[PDB]
Every structure is written in structure tokens, then in C-alpha cells.
């Protein structure tokens, strides 16, 4: 039931899961050994459930570590963002949101977005007002054992990503300075504008694909969290340690994730 599986000793998992003599398996065991001895990661919580796994892993880290709302949410109310885009964007524009695996075609994308975004606001607020990490831990095991609620929070996060994509696109069109990552996003045909991004990429997250690397950048930027990732299959190479985004002069909160294939992001436990 629990989608962020119970912790297992890193060296045990490494020895049991990656037994063998192939060049790839040998490299994987060296990577995990590096994680243990150099970075003092003692255990691992596996996150391999569905195509929301990237969002599942990041959200788990935010709540478990007690990270609060990003700065731009201080002034803007989260629950009003669906209305703002309903207003700024077209009535048909917003009705094209499909809610990933729901493959929704009903008549109120607006009501659903507002409800789900409200649930994320409520849940996130509850975690912010708890200083004891243990209490947050048990709450996470409860939350991530309720897949129906999980999906609603993930679609809320996907909407927040879409909102930031729409904000930054408007900045680019009005000749404002924007992050090079967003300018890169809009250079791709299938994501040249927020509508294309939603229909061709975001609508698929959780249904047939997970978050791509560029999507991890958008998520971190949107939540103002530095997502540090150990890419184990790239051990002994430049991109073994990566951060989404690469905003050195940010002073944002930071979370760490482990991945063997850029598809599933396991939780490092110290």
C-alpha cells in the first residue's frame, strides 16, 4: 500500500539487487558504496510505483523535511490560480487539462483544479505547522498509502508547474529576462508555448510517462527547492551529481534523491 517503501540498509539492497559481474552491475555497486562511505547514506526507501514517481519522491521529501511554501505563494493565493488562468487564458485553453491517468473529458476542469489545489494547500499547511520530524514521518506513511489523495496532489503540482510555465512564457513574449532553462523549453516544437507543453508533455505525466529532466528543472524552480540527484548509472562521469535547477545564488532549501535510470527516484536516508 505504502508507495514510499520502508527503508532498507543501503549496502544490503546494493548487494542483493545488483549482484552480478556485468560492467553495468559492477558500476552500480561502486556507486552505492560511494553513497555510503563518502555521503554517509545509510538506508534507502524505494519509490517504484507508477509514472508519478518523480513527483511522488519530491513531494515526500518536501513534507518529510518540513519545507514550506515558496516565496511567490506568500502574496498569491494558491487556490485562486485556476481562476487566474481561467481569466488570463482561454476558456477552452484550460478545459484541455486531462489530469494524467484520469484522461478527463468532463465539463469542469476548473472545479477539479481548484479542489485538488486546495487539498495540496491544506495538506502542505498541516506539514508546515509540525516541528517534530517523527510526527511528519508517520503522516507521510499515511499520506503515501492513500493513492487517491496522492494523485490529486500530483495533479496540483503539475498545475503549479503549468502556472509557472505560463507566467514565464508571458515574460519572454513581453521581452523580459527569463531563465535560460525556460527559453530552452520553448525552443522545443512540442513545448513552444504553455498550451503545447500541457497537451504534449504535462497531460501525459502520470499516465504514460514520468517527469523528464527538463520537467525536474521546472518543478524545482516552481517550488523554489534545489533537487539534488545522484545519478548512479553515471558514476565515474561528470553528471553523477546534478541539481535541478542549477541556481547557485539561490539559498533555497535542498533535497537529495537517488536514481538508477532517471525514471525512479529513491529516497536517501542518513
UniProtKB/Swiss-Prot annotation:
Compartment annotation: Cytoplasm; Endoplasmic reticulum membrane; Nucleus envelope
Documented effect of changing residue 266 to N: Fails to confer catalytic activity
Domain OTU residues, every copy: 42-270
Effect the entry attributes to changing residue 53 to C: Fails to confer catalytic activity
Disulphide bridges, residue numbers: none
Keywords recorded for this protein, A-Z: Cytoplasm, Endoplasmic reticulum, Membrane, Nucleus
The keyword Nucleus appears for this protein: yes
Membrane topology: Peripheral membrane protein
Gene Ontology annotations for the cellular component aspect, listed alphabetically: cytoplasm; cytoplasmic side of endoplasmic reticulum membrane; nuclear envelope
Function: Lacks deubiquitinase activity.
Entry's family note: Belongs to the peptidase C65 family. Otulin subfamily.
Domain note: The N-terminal region that precedes the OTU domain mediates interaction with cellular membranes.
Quaternary structure annotation from Swiss-Prot or TrEMBL: Does not bind ubiquitin or ubiquitin-like proteins.
Protein name: Inactive ubiquitin thioesterase OTULINL
